């Protein structure tokens, strides 16, 4: 519920400006941002076949996008990022995924955890 509302809004804001993209070089940073955030959430909605996700795996992925951690990441690299990022959180942060389920949401503590997992991961990713 939490992360999905923000995604819905930012995709809707994206849809309005979506045509300013391929025909835009001299855009203001406000609409440059909406486009960037938009193309990136769009990438996070892509999904392989025959591999449905647990709700907490889904929120973890959307978190990365809606919090702006993937804004500087190149669009083509997002699918690779997600797969890898998710493989990581599943392998090493089962308790964090266990928490997001138990808590029913992302607490301040889970938020903090994710912030440091994503940032450091992303840094490693673009190394």
């Amino acid at each position: 519920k939490q992360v999905a509302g923000t995604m819905k809004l930012e995709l809707a804001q994206y849809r309005e400006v979506a045509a300013f993209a391929q025909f835009g070089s001299d855009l203001d940073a406000a609409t440059q941002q909406l486009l960037s955030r938009g193309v990136r959430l769009t990438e996070l909605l892509k999904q392989g076949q025959y591999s449905p996700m647990a709700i907490e795996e889904q929120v973890a992925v959307i978190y990365a996008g809606v919090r702006g951690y993937l804004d500087k990441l190149e669009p083509s690299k997002i699918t690779k990022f997600e797969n890898a990022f998710l493989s990581h959180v599943i392998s090493q942060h089962q308790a964090l995924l266990s928490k997001i389920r138990t808590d029913g949401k992302i607490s301040e503590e889970s938020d903090a955890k994710l912030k440091e997992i994503v940032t450091n991961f992303l840094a490693g990713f673009e190394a």
Binding site: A19, F20, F23, G24, D26, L27, D28
Partner: peptide, 17 residues
Amino acid sequence: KNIQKITKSMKMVAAAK
């Protein structure tokens, strides 16, 4: 429909300039 959206966005680009 696309052409309408492009030319309106170009109007905006040329308006700020």
